[PDB]
Amino acid sequence: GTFERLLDKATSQLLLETDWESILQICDLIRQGDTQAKYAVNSIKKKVNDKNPHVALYALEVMESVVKNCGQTVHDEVANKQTMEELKDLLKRQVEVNVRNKILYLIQAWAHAFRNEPKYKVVQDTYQIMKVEGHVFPEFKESDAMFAAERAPDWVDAEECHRCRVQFGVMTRKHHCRACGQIFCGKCSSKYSTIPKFGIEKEVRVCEPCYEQLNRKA
Numbered sequence: 001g002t003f004e005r006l007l008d009k010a011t012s013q014l015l016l017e018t019d020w021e022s023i024l025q026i027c028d029l030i031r032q033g034d035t036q037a038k039y040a041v042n043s044i045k046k047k048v049n050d051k052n053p054h055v056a057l058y059a060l061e062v063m064e065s066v067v068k069n070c071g072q073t074v075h076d077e078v079a080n081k082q083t084m085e086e087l088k089d090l091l092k093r094q095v096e097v098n099v100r101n102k103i104l105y106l107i108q109a110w111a112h113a114f115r116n117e118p119k120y121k122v123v124q125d126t127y128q129i130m131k132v133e134g135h136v137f138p139e140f141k142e143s144d145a146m147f148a149a150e151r152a153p154d155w156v157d158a159e160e161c162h163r164c165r166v167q168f169g170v171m172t173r174k175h176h177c178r179a180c181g182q183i184f185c186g187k188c189s190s191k192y193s194t195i196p197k198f199g200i201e202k203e204v205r206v207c208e209p210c211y212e213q214l215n216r217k218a
């Protein structure tokens, strides 16, 4: 029961200050596959709801790290209605400022990190409604919300268009979709889109399948 010992250690009400080494080890356990994301997150959540606010805050610190460091299987456990309702309720009953601030901080950082994913829109909606209702968030640093970004794919070379298979030549020239990296003729890659996921906020050439995925993602 390594995960459980580490989580107890990291959230102890005898712990003076945050135990980063246990937290990094917990993240490694989830990344290596030794602890499954669902179980890990549910376990951390039990600690978040502890009556002692030192334990609760240490638990939120574990939650922050596992979300930042462990990928989509952990994102999917927090970026949902159930967790947003739980955090709103936890916020409502907090008296200690550092705990209230940490919850607000996380809602905001996650809302940014998960923006333009329809599945996770409930996080942005929670941020928006808390802001509307007068909750003052800590100052946002974009650096706290880059953890889900990926880089754009490498480009493929081929002698025909990936979509229509027209053969490239001197007068049928090559283009690429920045979202999938495939190679296209001009007719098949006429769309332009940003690609927030890859850090692209300029409008860049995409194919129609990628344009629609990204269009409906916005």
Ligand SMILES: O=P(O)(O)O[C@@H]1[C@H](O)[C@H](OP(=O)(O)O)[C@@H](O)[C@H](O)[C@H]1O
Residues within 6 Å of the ligand: 173, 174, 175, 176, 177, 205
């Ligand atoms: O000007 P060309 O000699 O046809 O060169 C092509 C362009 O630079 C294309 O840019 P684009 O995707 O921005 O249109 C690029 O995708 C192709 O791979 C190149 O072969």
Ligand SMILES: [Zn+2]
Residues within 6 Å of the ligand: 161, 162, 163, 164, 165, 166, 184, 185, 186, 187, 188
């Ligand atoms: Zn084509």
Ligand SMILES: [Zn+2]
Residues within 6 Å of the ligand: 177, 178, 179, 180, 181, 182, 206, 207, 208, 209, 210, 211
């Ligand atoms: Zn594409």
